[PDB]
Structures are given as C-alpha cells and as structure tokens.
C-alpha cells in the first residue's frame, strides 16, 4: 500500500463506456473503475449514471489509499463525462482543477467508414 494523498484523475468518456483511472502525480494508476467495473454490462455502461457510479467507485477506492486532492483530466466526448466530473467533484475528494485533453489529430489516419465524412 502506497498512501499517496495527492493525485490525478483521468475520465475517459466514450458513447459506450465511461472509465475512470486514478493515478498519482507521476501518472501511475492506483485504482480505477468503469461502467463495467460496476455491475453494468451492455449499452447501460455508457449511461451518465453508470458514469457517476464509476467515478464515485474510483474515488472511494482511492480514498482507501488515503488520497485527498486530485487534478482532473477529461478525454473523449461522451455521455456523462460531465456526470463523472460532478461525482468526483463531491466525492469528498477535492478537485483542484479540471482540464480537457481529448486528443485530436492534424489529419493523420483515415477513419473507419463509421467516422468518415471527415478525416
């Protein structure tokens, strides 16, 4: 057991799942969660509620490691990314900041047919 107490919280949000990895200041994960980590299975994972549960789980799991304050990073644009942020926001865990890191390419790789009409 580490007992970090100052850390990072990554919210990875897609239209399918939301998944929350909580690392330490050097970015190594500690605990994590997701719609699947909680009981959810199908499309129900990409729920905003599912998200909330995931966030809170990650947060409590991380409390166990004695974490207190955390910087947030948000990647991906998905249902209940924001809900994840709310959850974390009052988990009792302190959010010292949010940041949106969602990656975009400068047009490198051809998307799948699903994603075309843009490259």
């Amino acid at each position: 057991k580490r007992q970090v107490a100052s850390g990072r919280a990554y919210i990875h949000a897609s239209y399918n799942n939301t998944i929350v990895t909580i690392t330490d200041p050097d970015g190594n994960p500690i605990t994590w969660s997701s719609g699947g980590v909680i009981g959810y299975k199908g499309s129900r994972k990409g729920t905003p509620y599912a998200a909330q549960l995931a966030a809170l789980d990650a947060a409590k799991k991380a409390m166990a490691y004695g974490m207190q304050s955390v910087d947030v990073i948000v990647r991906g644009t998905g249902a209940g990314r924001e809900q994840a942020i709310r959850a974390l926001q009052a988990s009792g865990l302190q959010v010292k900041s949010i940041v949106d890191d969602t990656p975009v390419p400068h047009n490198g790789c051809r998307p799948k047919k699903k994603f075309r009409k843009a490259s």
Binding site: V99, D100, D101, H106
Partner: protein
C-alpha cells in the same frame, strides 16, 4: 459575436513577418494552441494569411505551441 476584443486593436505597429517575436505572436493563439480566426484577430485577408505562416514557423522553431490543453472545463 466576438466583439469583446480585436487582437489587432490591442497593440500597434509590429512586424507580421517576425516569427521570432513570441510575446506578440502568442496573442493570436487561443486558450488551445489554435490560431485565432479573423473574427478574433481583426486582421485582413492578406494580413491573416501572413500571420498563419509566421506563426507556423514560430511553432516549428519551438517558440509557440502546436497545441494546448484546455484549463477549467
């Protein structure tokens, strides 16, 4: 909208071709690394067009960002 400020009106005479001048150049990027549209820069077609290249140069040189993470959110 974007009537809040025109980046051109902010400062006076400067060399649109100076890719080494960071303090002024930064003014034309956004919170993200993005180059501000004409709406924001208040430049002309030609002006803006020159700014583009000079800025890119400054990026490659390492003085300006290609991209920035978004704070708050």
């Amino acid at each position: 909208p974007s009537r809040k400020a025109k980046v051109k009106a902010t400062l006076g005479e400067f060399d649109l071709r100076d890719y080494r001048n960071v303090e002024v150049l930064k003014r034309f990027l956004s919170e993200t690394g993005k180059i501000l549209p004409r709406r924001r820069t208040g430049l002309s077609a030609k002006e803006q067009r020159i700014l583009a290249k000079t800025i890119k140069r400054a990026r490659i040189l390492g003085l300006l960002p290609f991209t920035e993470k978004l704070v708050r959110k």
